[PDB]
Write a protein that binds this ligand. Structure first.
Ligand code: HEM
Ligand code: HEM
Ligand SMILES: C[C@H](O)[C@H](O)[C@H]1CNc2nc(N)[nH]c(=O)c2N1
Ligand SMILES: C[C@H](O)[C@H](O)[C@H]1CNc2nc(N)[nH]c(=O)c2N1
Ligand SMILES: NC1=N[C@H](c2cccs2)Nc2cccc(F)c21
Ligand SMILES: NC1=N[C@H](c2cccs2)Nc2cccc(F)c21
Ligand SMILES: NC1=N[C@H](c2cccs2)Nc2cccc(F)c21
Ligand SMILES: NC1=N[C@H](c2cccs2)Nc2cccc(F)c21
Ligand SMILES: [Zn+2]
Lengths: 420, 420
């Protein structure tokens, strides 16, 4: 009937009726393009109540095993046949099947390598894999999670890593991290109508209160890990301050910039995505890279829906703040980016300027089309929030499609959960 | 088999094979998105050899007439029936049919209003329409074209206008403007391996030489109008210097900025697009708006494939030009934008800063979803080449689809032309 459209700024909504009068055919769909949609169902993989039908779990299983053994130079044919063999057996013996650690490792880099929205895929090979497939309880998740955070933070010399938890069996014994990301600040909707901390989190920050968390009502409070294991209920876990490393924001000129008091954690880790490989699916598997300047400087510090600091950084800059055409916004935002850039470098925290990141992507793309002729790429995501055209990737045409293995999104845990 | 991908920067090409292993379904197409493609066939409308099949030319004809009469408050029912009547008759009397001037006027604003890539659609109502449907020869095109340029330039107070030429009959009597745009500089691939003027034009600039134009080998030479009428051959016409208004580039601080000697015409007019309305199609119909700062400042002055001036504007700024991470590119580009902005304002030439343009679009979108529930919008095009996230439209989800009436692209004239 109609498509819903969200404006993540005003968070307003709209119902598109008009698109029905869509003439004939478009560039990919029968007249209609939803590439501008944030979370399309096409990239999600939701809940379940029963296991995974053998007539599928098996075809996909075989496919992966081929991709796998058909990888390393000089194939181990007997093993390729051998595995396929044991695989089938195991499948037709318990329904699902288990992966060999070398497979997981393969799966994860491939999946990562297949993330159309990632721009640092040139590193797809150097990835740490933590096998937690035999985890049992919430307390054990929380333990591996700490292990992870500690490993990737490496005191500023960030390291990409992923810690794979228990795969999905039937669908009622899922392991899920309820948070959006490993480390993330909390946002309270304080009295005076204002909002402190991270306007983004708001909702989640509440659930943490409802599940019993102590809101230290501040501007940079690292939210608690809300872990649910085996399909049980989520148990709240606060993170060891000692583990969350942060950079303090200071400009290389304007000395009044530290007066703003801003800071930000140095570890970007996606917590709620889902890995799909060989017709198997792990609903819990956090992975992390490292920041790219403008993420913090332009998205987190300068968004109507986040910390929102653009104007004030301008006022303390002179700029005719009340006259759009003056380009004060353009000037301000740029210095803020020098700040975040300056700061991490000073305090020694692996970070990357958007200009060198784009160049690095292009390289990777080359090797990737040369390597396997193709490279999934969502333009809307790979081009920086600022200075787009001044970058290589902006002028680069690209095709976006889901392959496999692959990393998917998934319905918010609290929405679909049996609170026994 | 495979899809071609172009990188409009290096102009390099690639063949995407991989997309075939596309899992299942995507956000719009059966796993595959080409929204990042510049000129997809979906938005083009090409050549013909025979008239337009009555079983179509008629259904579409009726559809438009309904949209039309179903527009103005308090319908002229008898006329709505009356027209539909005369329309049918005329159609079943000569094949195609003619539009009433009020229809063209309607058609054009609707078409414009339906341009998913236009960001100034909030002006869709104030548009000047010039009826040239009875033009006959090249010399007559060249005349209306001058008329047009003169009208829209209005000595700096730019005015949106469109001059509709002879519709399409069979397909061998097409009227086409061969240039990409009314006013555009020429690019010569000079001796020393360098390139002067506009690297973009290059190819076309040659054809103008081959059709007998005198290359004044400079940095800002307005190309000649290459007009072909009735399906004949293109005749070259130089433009009256007196008509092409230009702004001289000068910074409000760095006084050495005029030393660069840069300038740019104040009239943006698309020349080669095709209007489709009521199953009719006019292959020649130039329309114009007015510039939006960053078009000149970021796309034309700062592109590996255009004038390319970013570095030098930085060197004369101090900036550590050889260290990407220094953000000199970000700083430089911004001042250049102050320049182009400063300059037009000074010299009194209707221009618009990208920040107020986005705000203005959002408004329009609101009225548009409220008006007819929907608004075709190509995100990739509506979000500025710089300071994207600092704008409203970046966070706005949107649907892109072709409606009608509508403005289409079309195969380069010289590619498909009988040179008798
Ligand atoms: C080593 C350095 C890395 C860098 C600089 C990098 C950078 C980025 C950036 C800037 C984004 C966009 C985030 C946003 O728009 O909010 C992104 C997204 C993504 N990256 Fe990477 N990445 C790296 C490593 C990894 C690794 C190791 C994986 C997986 C194992 C990965 C998986 C993805 C996925 C799935 C997304 C999409 C996330 C989403 O849609 O929310 N990245 N990355
Ligand atoms: C009055 C002020 C106007 C402004 C500020 C405006 C601005 C723009 C801008 C910035 C673009 C992007 C160009 C590019 O990316 O190279 C664009 C595209 C477009 N506009 Fe508008 N526009 C205006 C009026 C009009 C009018 C009067 C029409 C038609 C009658 C129109 C039709 C379109 C079309 C078809 C495109 C797509 C052109 C293409 O794909 O190459 N615009 N406009
Ligand atoms: C590959 C890519 O689609 C291409 O560079 C596009 C991106 N968006 C654009 N948007 C606008 N307005 N104008 C352009 O020329 C382009 N180029
Ligand atoms: C509507 C729109 O799709 C949305 O704002 C997108 C655009 N591109 C993005 N690109 C990245 N990397 N990150 C984002 O959060 C967004 N937001
Ligand atoms: N840099 C990144 N941006 C977002 C995050 C921001 C904050 C936490 S995760 N997502 C990513 C996912 C994986 C690796 C990364 F490096 C990133
Ligand atoms: N109101 C404000 N808008 C800008 C914005 C930054 C990001 C989005 S809007 N900056 C500010 C900074 C400090 C205090 C403020 F009140 C503002
Ligand atoms: N501003 C514009 N940008 C491009 C052009 C750039 C140069 C000539 S046309 N296309 C448009 C088409 C119509 C009206 C406009 F305003 C524009
Ligand atoms: N080589 C150059 N690169 C930048 C670019 C501008 C736009 C794209 S690259 N600017 C320059 C300006 C002057 C002379 C130059 F040689 C350059
Ligand atoms: Zn699409």
């Amino acid at each position: 009937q109609y498509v819903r459209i969200k404006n993540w700024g005003s968070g307003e909504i709209l119902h598109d009726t008009l698109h029905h009068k869509a003439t004939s055919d478009f560039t990919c769909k029968s007249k209609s393009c939803l590439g501008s949609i944030m979370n399309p169902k096409s990239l999600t993989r939701g809940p379940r109540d029963k296991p995974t039908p053998l007539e599928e779990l098996l075809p996909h299983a075989i496919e992966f095993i081929n991709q796998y053994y058909g990888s390393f130079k000089e194939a181990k044919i007997e093993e390729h046949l051998a595995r396929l063999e044991a695989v089938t057996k195991e499948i037709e013996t318990t329904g699902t099947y288990q992966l060999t650690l070398d497979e997981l490792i393969f799966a994860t880099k491939m999946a990562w390598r297949n993330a159309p929205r990632c721009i640092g895929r040139i590193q797809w090979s150097n990835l740490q894999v933590f096998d937690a497939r035999n985890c049992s309880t919430a307390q054990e998740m929380f333990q591996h999670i700490c292990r992870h955070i500690l490993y990737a933070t490496n005191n500023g010399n960030i390291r990409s890593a992923i810690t794979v938890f228990p795969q999905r069996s039937d669908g009622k014994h899922d392991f899920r991290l309820w948070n959006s990301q490993l480390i993330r600040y909390a946002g309270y909707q304080m009295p005076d109508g204002t909002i402190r901390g991270d306007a983004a989190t708001l909702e989640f920050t509440q659930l943490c209160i409802d599940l019993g968390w102590k809101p230290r009502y501040g501007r940079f409070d690292v939210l608690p890990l809300v872990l649910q294991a085996d399909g049980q209920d989520p148990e709240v876990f606060e993170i060891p301050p000692d583990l969350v490393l942060e950079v303090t924001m200071e400009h290389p000129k304007y000395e009044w910039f530290q007066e703003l008091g801003l800071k930000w954690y140095a570890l970007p880790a996606v917590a709620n995505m889902l890995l799909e490989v060989g017709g198997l699916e792990f609903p819990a598997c956090p992975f992390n890279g490292w920041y790219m300047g403008t993420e913090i400087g332009v998205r987190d510090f300068c968004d109507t829906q986040r910390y929102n600091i653009l104007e004030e950084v301008g006022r303390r800059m002179g700029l005719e703040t009340h006259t759009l055409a003056s380009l004060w916004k353009d000037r301000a935002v740029t210095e803020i980016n020098v700040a975040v850039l300056h700061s991490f470098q000073k305090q020694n925290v692996t970070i990357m300027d958007h200009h060198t990141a784009s160049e690095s992507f292009m390289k990777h793309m080359q090797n990737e089309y040369r390597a396997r002729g193709g490279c999934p790429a969502d333009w809307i995501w790979l081009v920086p929030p600022v200075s787009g055209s001044i970058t290589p990737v902006f002028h680069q045409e690209m095709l976006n499609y889901v392959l496999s293995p692959f990393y998917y999104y998934q319905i918010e845990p609290w929405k679909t959960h049996i609170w026994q």
